C-alpha cells in the first residue's frame, strides 16, 4: 500500500 | 517565526511532478525533472548549499504510486478546477529608459497547470522571459510568477495572457506606461 516519502536534506558547502 | 516547507506533487494525466523547498513563501530551489538537476531560485544560494537531485526522483516515484492508489480509493474522484486571480505589476516604479521587470502574478488556483504568454505590442515574446515553478499555499492551492525584463517606453504596450481549465476564457492583463 501507500509508502512514506523521505524528508530530504540540503548540505553545507565547504567554505 | 520561520517556516521551511518541502513541497512535492504529482499530477495525472499530465504526468508532471514537482519538488521544491519553500522559505516563508519564497522558493529556495527546486529540482528540474527533465534535466535531473537542482535549480536555485537565486544563483547565490548555490554558493552555500547543495542538494542531491536524485533524492527527489525517488520521492516523486513514491508520490506517483500513492496518487494512483488514492485515485482508486476515491473512486476516481477528480479535482475541481479553481481558476487563478491574475495581476500584473513591476519590480520598481517605472522611468523611461531605465530597465525594469514586468511580473505576472497568478494566484489561488488548481490544478498546477497554466498556459502563460507575454505579449509586447500584441506579439508573443519568448526571449528573456522567465518563471517560477508552482508555489504552495495554506489552502493547498498554488501560485506562480512569470517575469519579463523590458525597457520602458511610450511606443510599447504589454499583455499577459493566462489559460487555465477553470476559466471560461483566457485572462488578458494589460500594462502600459
Amino acid at each position: 500500500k501507500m509508502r512514506m516519502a523521505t524528508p530530504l536534506l540540503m548540505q553545507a558547502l565547504p567554505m | 517565526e520561520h517556516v521551511i516547507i518541502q513541497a512535492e506533487f504529482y499530477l495525472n494525466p499530465d504526468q508532471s511532478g514537482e519538488f521544491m523547498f519553500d522559505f516563508d513563501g519564497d522558493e529556495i530551489f527546486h529540482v528540474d525533472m527533465a534535466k535531473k538537476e537542482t535549480v536555485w531560485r537565486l544563483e547565490e544560494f548555490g554558493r552555500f548549499a547543495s542538494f542531491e537531485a536524485q533524492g527527489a526522483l525517488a520521492n516523486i516515484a513514491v508520490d506517483k504510486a500513492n496518487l494512483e492508489i488514492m485515485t482508486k480509493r476515491s473512486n476516481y474522484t477528480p479535482i475541481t478546477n479553481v481558476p487563478p486571480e491574475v495581476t500584473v505589476l513591476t519590480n520598481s516604479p517605472v522611468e523611461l529608459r531605465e530597465p525594469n521587470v514586468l511580473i505576472c502574478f497568478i494566484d489561488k488556483f488548481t490544478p498546477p497547470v497554466v498556459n502563460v504568454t507575454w505579449l509586447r505590442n500584441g506579439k508573443p515574446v519568448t526571449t528573456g522571459v522567465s518563471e517560477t515553478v508552482f508555489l504552495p499555499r495554506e489552502d493547498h492551492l498554488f501560485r506562480k510568477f512569470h517575469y519579463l525584463p523590458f525597457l520602458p517606453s511610450t511606443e510599447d504596450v504589454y499583455d499577459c495572457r493566462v489559460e487555465h481549465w477553470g476559466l471560461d476564457e483566457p485572462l488578458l492583463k494589460h500594462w502600459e506606461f
Binding site: 512514506m4 524528508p7 | 518541502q6 499530477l11 552555500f48 476515491s74 505589476l89 502574478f105
Partner: protein
C-alpha cells in the same frame, strides 16, 4: 479544449521555527486533490486521519514502528539540520528598500525591492504624523525574494507644505525619508 479529469496528490513537510531553533514543530501533510487526508504532527508523534479517506494510511503507517521513530527524530535530523544549512542566506538575508514619492488629491509612497517583509511606513504633514486618510496596498511578494508596497495618503495640500514619507526596516539603522512639496 482538454477536459480530461485531473487527479492530484501533494506531500508537504512543514518545519515551523520559534526563537531560532528553540521550538521546532514538524508537520507532514498529505493532500489529495484539495483535501488534506492525513497528517503527522510532531506535537503528537503519530499520524492522524484528517478525513475518512486518510484513515487507512494513518492506521497503517502508525503500525511501522521503525519509520515512526524516524519521523519523531525529524525535528532534529531534518528541520534543525536544514535550518542551519540554509539560515545564512534566508534568515540573515537583508536587502534595503527603495523609496519614491509622487502624486497619483493623492500622494503615493512607493517602497520597493526590500527583504525581509516586516516593514514600517508612515506619513507626515509639516512634521506631524498623518494617520487618518492613509490607505495601503498591503505587503507584496514579487517571488524573487523581495517585497514591495504602496502607502497612499489622501489630501489637498496648500502650497509651501512639506509632506514626508518615512520608512523603517531592519536592513537600515536610520529611517529612510523622502520629501515632497507641491508647486503653485
Amino acid at each position: 479544449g482538454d477536459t480530461r479529469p485531473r487527479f492530484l496528490w501533494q506531500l508537504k513537510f512543514e518545519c515551523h521555527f520559534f526563537n531560532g531553533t528553540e521550538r521546532v514543530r514538524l508537520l507532514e501533510r498529505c493532500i489529495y486533490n484539495q483535501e488534506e487526508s492525513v497528517r503527522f504532527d510532531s506535537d503528537v508523534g503519530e499520524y492522524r486521519a484528517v478525513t475518512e479517506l486518510g484513515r487507512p494510511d494513518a492506521e497503517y503507517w502508525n503500525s511501522q514502528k521503525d519509520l515512526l521513530e524516524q519521523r519523531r527524530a525529524a525535528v532534529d535530523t531534518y528541520c534543525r539540520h536544514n535550518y542551519g544549512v540554509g539560515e545564512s542566506f534566508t534568515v540573515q538575508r537583508r536587502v534595503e528598500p527603495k523609496v519614491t514619492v509622487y502624486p497619483s488629491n493623492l500622494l503615493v509612497c512607493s517602497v520597493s525591492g526590500f527583504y525581509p517583509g516586516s516593514i514600517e511606513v508612515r506619513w507626515f504633514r509639516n512634521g506631524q504624523e498623518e494617520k487618518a486618510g492613509v490607505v495601503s496596498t498591503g505587503l507584496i511578494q514579487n517571488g524573487d525574494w523581495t517585497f514591495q508596497t504602496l502607502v497612499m495618503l489622501e489630501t489637498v495640500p496648500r502650497s509651501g507644505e512639506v509632506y514626508t514619507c518615512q520608512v523603517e526596516h531592519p536592513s537600515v539603522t536610520s529611517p529612510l525619508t523622502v520629501e515632497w512639496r507641491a508647486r503653485s
